């Protein structure tokens, strides 16, 4: 189990997971808050 | 000392031999000797100026010549300043310049003297020469009268800023109705 978690912590796996999480978060932000041209607060 | 300010308190030691000293210094502003000397001179000077101011404020009113608050009013909105029921031919600019020059010279000559001479300068300033012969009691009376006059001047200013009448009218109004005419009735001093 330790070796598996160590493999999941490698640079490529972590890079792909981080990019996927960031892309998913951005996609959902644009899905619920679309066409945000300016920062209207 | 002759006094204790707070009957059961412990007055400071540096205020034990000074005249008109009640040990009043809870904030400890006279802990340093230099500050104490400067404050002593300032207190005596303030008392003298306040006594003169209170005497003038009462005199101009009891003599039916006008109030202290409206004294510079005729000069503004036109001109002409009255004195003793006469007329002085001077404007605000000339009056300010004359007073500035006279006061600047007097204070400059007074402030450049020795520390003791800056608050108690005998000689030419005592024509009657009554300073000699135990001046401690006289100094105490002077300081106390100055403190009372300072409080009186502050009272004139605050009372006029609150009610709006001059000293004599305020005194007469309070004497007429001492129960419903005081600082508690006006909607400024006591809010609730």
């Amino acid at each position: 189990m330790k070796d598996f978690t160590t493999y999941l912590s490698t640079a490529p796996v972590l890079t792909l997971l981080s990019v996927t999480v960031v892309a998913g978060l951005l996609i959902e932000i644009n899905r619920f808050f679309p066409d945000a041209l300016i920062a209207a607060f | 000392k002759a006094g204790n300010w707070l009957p059961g308190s412990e007055t400071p030691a540096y205020l034990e031999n000074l005249p008109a000293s009640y040990g009043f210094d809870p904030l400890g502003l006279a802990a340093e000797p230099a500050s104490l000397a400067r404050f002593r001179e300032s207190e005596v000077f303030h008392g003298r100026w306040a006594m003169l101011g209170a005497a003038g404020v009462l005199g101009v009113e009891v003599l039916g010549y006008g109030n202290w608050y409206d004294a510079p009013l005729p000069l503004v909105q036109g001109g002409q300043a009255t004195y003793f029921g006469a007329s002085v031919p001077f404007d605000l600019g000339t009056l300010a310049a004359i007073e500035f020059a006279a006061m600047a010279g007097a204070e400059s000559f007074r402030g450049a003297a020795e520390p003791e001479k800056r608050v108690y300068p005998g000689g030419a300033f005592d024509p009657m020469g009554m300073s000699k012969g135990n001046s401690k009691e006289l100094k105490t009376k002077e300081i106390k009268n100055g403190r009372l006059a300072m409080l009186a001047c502050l009272g004139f200013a605050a009372q006029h800023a609150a009610t709006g009448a001059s000293p004599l009218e305020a005194l007469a109004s309070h004497l007429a109705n001492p129960m419903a005419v005081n600082f508690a009735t006006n909607g400024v001093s006591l809010p609730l």
Binding site: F32, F33 | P26, L27, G28, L29, A31, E32, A34, S35, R38, F39, P191, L192
Partner: protein, 219 residues
């Protein structure tokens, strides 16, 4: 050391220990690792807490009196505008500049005190009043002129307790002011109005129904 911590079971960071008032070992972001930075943050916390206490008092006490009936004052968010439309109202720019000019002098002097506590006590700096500008050794707690009644001067432990009470009240007032800002922005009502509305129906009147905290897009 063994004093209560913010999160029971979690050890306090070594950079905090337990000497500053209000020390509960709360620093998840490790912002106060540097000693100089920690000192500056301590002074900033004291200043923010005191100003927040004054503001929250000036916002709650007048509102409570107004609710009763005695002393009628406008709501804190409209107090600035109410005075603007007054007759002899001072211009906003001039008023702000005067306040900033006075605060410049006092705040710069306090700034010099932070760098060196006995800085303002330099002989001859003022007209004999510099003697009362010497701190107590810790920036942010200046006796002399301040603290005229001498509260907490009986002993060192008495002053420590008062410091803890001051820090807790300051933090509570800071959180309260942030709540006031958020409540007024979310609901155009006063703090007392919000409290009264919540007690009437807590499950139907709270931040989950104001329409601002929870975005309508998600629902």
């Amino acid at each position: 050391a063994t004093r209560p911590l913010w999160q029971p079971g979690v050890e306090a960071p070594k950079h905090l220990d337990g000497t500053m008032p209000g020390d509960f070992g709360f620093d998840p972001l490790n912002l106060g690792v540097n000693k100089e930075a920690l000192n500056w943050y301590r002074n900033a916390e004291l200043q923010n807490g005191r100003w927040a206490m004054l503001g929250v008092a000036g916002i709650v006490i007048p509102a409570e009196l107004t609710r009763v009936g005695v002393l009628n004052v406008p709501e804190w968010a409209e107090a600035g505008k109410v005075y603007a439309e007054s007759e002899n109202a001072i211009p906003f720019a001039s008023l702000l500049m005067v306040q900033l000019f006075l605060f410049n002098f006092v705040e710069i002097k306090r700034w010099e005190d932070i760098k060196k506590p006995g800085s303002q006590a330099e002989p001859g700096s003022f007209l004999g009043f510099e003697s009362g500008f010497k701190g107590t050794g810790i920036s942010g707690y200046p006796g002399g002129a301040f603290n005229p009644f001498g509260l907490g001067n009986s002993s060192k432990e008495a002053m420590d307790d008062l410091k803890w009470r001051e820090i807790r009240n300051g933090r509570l007032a800071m959180v309260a002011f942030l709540g006031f800002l958020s409540q007024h922005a979310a609901t155009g009502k006063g703090p007392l109005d919000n409290l009264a509305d919540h007690l009437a129906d807590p499950w139907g009147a709270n931040f989950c129904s104001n329409g601002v905290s929870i975005p309508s897009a998600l629902g």
